[PDB]
Design a protein around this ligand. Structure first.
Ligand SMILES: *[C@@H]1O[C@H](CO)[C@@H](O[C@@H]2O[C@H](CO)[C@@H](O)[C@H](O)[C@H]2NC(C)=O)[C@H](O)[C@H]1NC(C)=O
Ligand SMILES: CC(=O)N[C@@H]1[C@@H](O)[C@H](O)[C@@H](CO)O[C@H]1O
Ligand SMILES: CC(=O)N[C@@H]1[C@@H](O)[C@H](O)[C@@H](CO)O[C@H]1O
Ligand SMILES: CC(=O)N[C@@H]1[C@@H](O)[C@H](O)[C@@H](CO)O[C@H]1O
Ligand SMILES: CC(=O)N[C@@H]1[C@@H](O)[C@H](O)[C@@H](CO)O[C@H]1O
Ligand SMILES: *[C@@H]1O[C@H](CO)[C@@H](O)[C@H](O)[C@H]1NC(C)=O
Ligand SMILES: *[C@@H]1O[C@H](CO)[C@@H](O)[C@H](O)[C@H]1NC(C)=O
Lengths: 214, 97, 48
C-alpha cells in the first residue's frame, strides 16, 4: 500500500512480562514493515483474497474528517484440510459505525461461507471496540497459540493442534475507504522499548538492515 | 482438555487484604509481601509489573496493588539464657509503626 | 449427543448427577468426594 501508518505498530507489541522503562528483544509473528506486503488498493473485486501464512494484521486507515463507513474485515481462518472436528475462526464486523464486533471461534461442519449458530464454540463474545484516530489489530496462530490482539487487551489460548494456514479474509470492496491487510509468513525478531507503564513506543526489526542487527 | 490455560474455576476470587505479609501466587508467579492500594496505572496486556527484576505492582479484580517487601520476616536473637534474650530485626525500620 | 464447552466459568457442586444420593456414590473417595472422573490419561486424576 501507500499510506501504511508505521507508528501504529507500537500498539500491538507485548513482552512476556510487564516490564517498566526497559529495552527488550521479542520474537514471534509480527507484521511486515515492507510496504509491498499490505494488500490495500485493490479495486478489482478481489479485496477478499487469501493467504497461506501464520497470522494476519488489519489496519483501519483514519477516522478524522464518509463518516459511518467503517471496516468489515470478515476473516475466516481455515485448518487447511478441513474435517468435522477441526476448528475455525470467524471474526466479523459491519459498517457500524458503533462498536460491535464478534469473534466466535466455533466448530463448524461445512467449509463454504458463518451461519446463525454452530456446535461446540470455545470463545463467543462481542468485545466492543471504539474507533480511534487510527486503529490496528491482528490475530496470530504460530504453533497453535491463538493470540487475538485488540489493543489494549489481548486473549491467549494454547490449543493442541489446529494447523491453520488458509485465511480467506475479506473487506467491503469499493467502500468509503480501503482498509489494509498484512498476511505474515515467517516470524521476526524485534527490539522494543517500553515506557513508564509498560507500553512499547519504539521498535526496530532485527533483519531490516545492518545497524538493526547490531 | 482442548486448551491449556482456559481455567474453569469455582468461586470467583475476591479482593485481598491490604497490610499483612502473605505469600501470594498470582499468574504462575509466587511471591511474598504486603499490598496497598495505588493510583498507578499500567498496560492492559499485563497483570504483573516489573521494575528491573522485582515485582512492583499486581492487578487483582481491576485494582492495582503496589507490592512491598514485608520487613519483619527475619530477626536475630541476642541470646543469653532461657529467660533473657534480645531481638534485632535487621531489615525493619521502626521510626513510626 | 450434545456437547458443552467449559471455559472461563464456574462449575457448580454435583449438578451433573441426579439429586438422589444412592446412585452416584461410586464416584465417592473421601470427605472430599466431588470427583467426576474415574481413570485419567495422562493428567493427575483428582480434581481440586
Ligand atoms: C520510569 O521512568 C520515568 C522517567 O524517567 C520515571 O519517572 C520519574 O520518576 C521520578 C521519581 O522516582 C521523578 O522524580 C521524575 O521526575 C520522573 N520523571 C519523569 C520524566 O516523569 C518513573 O519513575 C520510572 N519508573 C517506574 C514507572 O516504575
Ligand atoms: C529492503 C526491502 O524492503 N526489500 C523488499 C524485498 O525484501 C521484497 O522482496 C520486495 C518485494 O518483493 O520489496 C522490497
Ligand atoms: C450437523 C448436521 O446437521 N449434519 C452433519 C453433516 O453436515 C456432516 O457431513 C456429518 C459428518 O460428521 O455430520 C452431520
Ligand atoms: C454479583 C457480583 O459478583 N458482583 C460483583 C461486584 O460486587 C463488583 O463490584 C464487581 C467488580 O468486578 O464484580 C461483580
Ligand atoms: C522451659 C524453658 O523455657 N527453659 C528451661 C529452664 O527453665 C530450665 O532452668 C532449664 C534447665 O536446664 O531447662 C530449660
Ligand atoms: C454465541 O453467542 C450468541 C449471542 O449471545 C448466541 O446467540 C449463540 O447461541 C452463541 N453460540 C454458542 C455456540 O454458544
Ligand atoms: C524482656 O523484658 C521483660 C520485662 O519484664 C522481661 O521478661 C525481661 O527482662 C526481658 N527478656 C525476656 C527474654 O523476657
Amino acid at each position: 500500500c501507500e499510506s501504511v501508518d508505521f507508528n501504529l505498530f507500537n500498539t500491538i507489541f507485548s513482552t512476556h512480562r510487564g516490564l517498566s522503562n526497559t529495552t527488550s528483544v521479542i520474537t514471534g509473528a509480527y507484521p511486515s514493515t515492507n510496504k509491498s506486503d499490505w494488500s490495500c488498493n485493490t479495486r478489482t473485486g478481489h479485496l477478499s483474497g487469501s493467504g497461506f501464512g501464520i497470522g494476519l494484521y488489519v489496519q483501519t486507515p483514519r477516522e478524522q474528517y464518509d463518516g459511518s463507513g467503517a471496516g468489515g474485515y470478515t476473516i475466516a481462518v481455515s485448518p487447511i484440510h478441513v474435517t468435522n472436528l477441526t476448528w475455525e475462526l470467524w471474526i466479523h464486523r459491519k459498517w457500524g459505525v458503533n462498536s460491535v464486533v464478534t469473534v466466535r471461534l466455533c466448530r463448524w461442519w461445512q467449509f463454504m461461507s458463518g451461519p446463525t449458530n454452530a456446535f461446540e464454540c470455545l470463545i463467543n463474545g462481542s468485545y466492543p471496540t471504539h474507533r480511534n484516530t487510527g486503529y490496528m489489530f491482528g490475530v496470530t496462530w504460530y504453533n497453535d497459540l491463538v493470540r487475538i490482539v485488540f489493543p489494549p487487551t489481548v486473549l491467549e489460548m494454547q490449543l493442541d493442534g489446529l494447523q491453520w494456514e488458509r485465511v480467506q479474509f475479506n473487506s467491503p470492496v469499493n467502500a468509503g475507504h480501503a482498509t489494509r491487510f498484512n498476511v505474515v509468513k515467517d516470524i521476526s525478531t524485534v527490539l522494543v522499548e517500553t515506557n513508564s507503564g509498560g507500553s512499547v513506543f519504539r521498535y526496530s526489526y532485527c533483519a531490516d538492515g545492518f545497524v538493526n542487527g547490531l | 482438555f482442548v486448551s491449556t490455560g482456559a481455567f474453569v474455576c469455582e468461586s470467583n476470587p475476591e479482593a485481598p487484604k491490604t497490610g499483612v505479609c502473605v505469600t501470594y501466587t498470582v499468574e504462575k508467579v509466587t511471591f511474598q509481601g504486603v499490598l496497598y492500594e495505588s493510583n498507578f496505572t499500567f498496560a492492559q496486556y499485563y497483570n504483573l509489573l516489573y521494575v528491573g527484576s522485582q515485582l512492583r505492582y499486581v492487578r487483582i479484580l481491576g485494582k492495582v496493588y503496589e507490592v512491598s517487601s514485608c520487613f519483619e520476616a527475619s530477626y536475630d536473637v541476642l541470646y543469653r539464657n532461657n529467660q533473657s534474650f534480645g531481638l534485632l530485626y535487621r531489615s525493619f525500620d521502626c521510626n513510626q509503626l | 449427543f450434545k456437547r458443552a464447552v467449559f471455559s472461563n466459568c464456574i462449575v457448580n457442586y454435583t449438578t451433573w448427577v441426579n439429586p438422589d444420593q444412592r446412585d452416584f456414590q461410586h464416584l465417592i473417595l473421601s470427605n472430599g468426594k466431588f470427583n467426576p472422573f474415574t481413570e485419567c490419561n495422562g493428567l493427575n486424576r483428582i480434581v481440586d
